[PDB]
Structure formats: structure tokens, C-alpha cells
From Swiss-Prot, chain A:
Stretches the record annotates as Interaction with NCOA6: 1-111
Compartments where located: Nucleus
GO terms classed as biological process: mRNA processing; regulation of mRNA splicing, via spliceosome; regulation of transcription by RNA polymerase II; RNA splicing
Protein family (similarity comment): Belongs to the splicing factor SR family.
Residues of the full protein shown: 420 to 530 of 530
Origin superkingdom: Eukaryota
Name of the protein in its database record: RNA-binding protein 39
Swiss-Prot record, chain B:
Record family assignment: Belongs to the splicing factor SR family.
Gene: U2af2
Complete-protein stretch covered: 89 to 97 of 475
Subcellular location: Nucleus
Domain of life: Eukaryota
Function: Plays a role in pre-mRNA splicing and 3'-end processing. By recruiting PRPF19 and the PRP19C/Prp19 complex/NTC/Nineteen complex to the RNA polymerase II C-terminal domain (CTD), and thereby pre-mRNA, may couple transcription to splicing. Required for the export of mRNA out of the nucleus, even if the mRNA is encoded by an intron-less gene. Positively regulates pre-mRNA 3'-end processing by recruiting the CFIm complex to cleavage and polyadenylation signals.
Organism this protein belongs to: Mus musculus (Mouse)
Protein name from the UniProt record: Splicing factor U2AF 65 kDa subunit
Summary of subunit composition and partner proteins: Interacts with U2AF1L4. Heterodimer with U2AF1. Binds unphosphorylated SF1. Interacts with SCAF11 and SNW1. Interacts with ZRSR2/U2AF1-RS2. Interacts with RBM17. Interacts with PRPF19; the interaction is direct. Interacts with POLR2A (via the C-terminal domain); Interacts with PRPF19; the interaction is direct. Interacts with POLR2A (via the C-terminal domain); recruits PRPF19 and the Prp19 complex to the pre-mRNA. Interacts with KHDC4 (Isoform 2). Interacts with ZRSR2. Interacts with the SF3B complex composed of SF3B1, SF3B2, SF3B3, SF3B4, SF3B5, SF3B6 and PHF5A.
Length: 111, 9
């Protein structure tokens, strides 16, 4: 598959077994913190409804996304193996139009 | 909080 600025993480959680309030905000912060070791994030969306446990990410550049996908794919997260896969830029922008103009690097919500 | 690189129990 061809590398792009965007990718999807899968198997990050099971929404049916997530009971704690603001659990998706904690997942978001886990992804931002981990991608700061690479090139950062400009857009993130935690899918609270798919059983697959999907997280959508947009990096500031294709190089930043390659660094993040290579480092995150096949990792353990909360005792489960996660998959990282590229998302074509028109597919990502159709899902998240507000990500088209995103430029600012995201900061985690928690300390 | 530790979830990254945590293998199954």
C-alpha cells in the first residue's frame, strides 16, 4: 500500500467493554503522546461506535505518517495487537472535511 | 496509566 499523511489504527479498544466516562479522550491522548516520538498529529478521531476499535489519524507530513505507521503497527496495546494502515487522502477528507485545513500540532488533554 | 506495549495477561 502507498504511504499518505493519514492512517487508521485498529484493535485499540472494544466500545462495548468501555464503561469509564471520557475513555475515548484517554485513547486520543495515548495516540498523541506516542506520535510525539515521531512527527506529531494534526487531526485525530476515536471511533466510539465500530466494534473494531478504530482511531483515525492525520500527520503534518507523509514522512511523519510513515514514521508513526512503522512504529505503531504490530504493537501491543492493552493486551491486544494493533494494526496501522494508510488511508488515501481523498477517503480521509471525505470522512473528516475539517482535517483538510488542520495545521496545528495537537496537545494531549491530560497532564 | 500503562497500555502501550502491555502483553495479554
Amino acid at each position: 500500500p502507498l504511504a499518505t499523511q493519514c492512517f487508521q489504527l485498529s484493535n485499540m479498544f472494544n466500545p462495548q467493554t468501555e464503561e469509564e466516562v471520557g475513555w475515548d479522550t484517554e485513547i486520543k491522548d495515548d495516540v498523541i503522546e506516542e506520535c510525539n516520538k515521531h512527527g506529531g498529529v494534526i487531526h485525530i478521531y476515536v471511533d466510539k461506535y465500530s466494534a473494531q476499535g478504530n482511531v483515525y489519524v492525520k500527520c503534518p507530513s507523509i514522512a511523519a505518517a510513515i514514521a508513526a505507521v512503522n512504529a505503531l503497527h504490530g504493537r501491543w496495546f492493552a493486551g491486544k495487537m494493533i494494526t496501522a494502515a494508510y488511508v488515501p487522502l481523498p477517503t480521509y477528507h471525505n470522512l473528516f472535511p475539517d482535517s483538510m485545513t488542520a495545521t496545528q500540532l495537537l496537545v494531549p488533554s491530560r497532564r | 496509566r500503562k497500555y502501550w506495549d502491555v502483553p495479554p495477561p
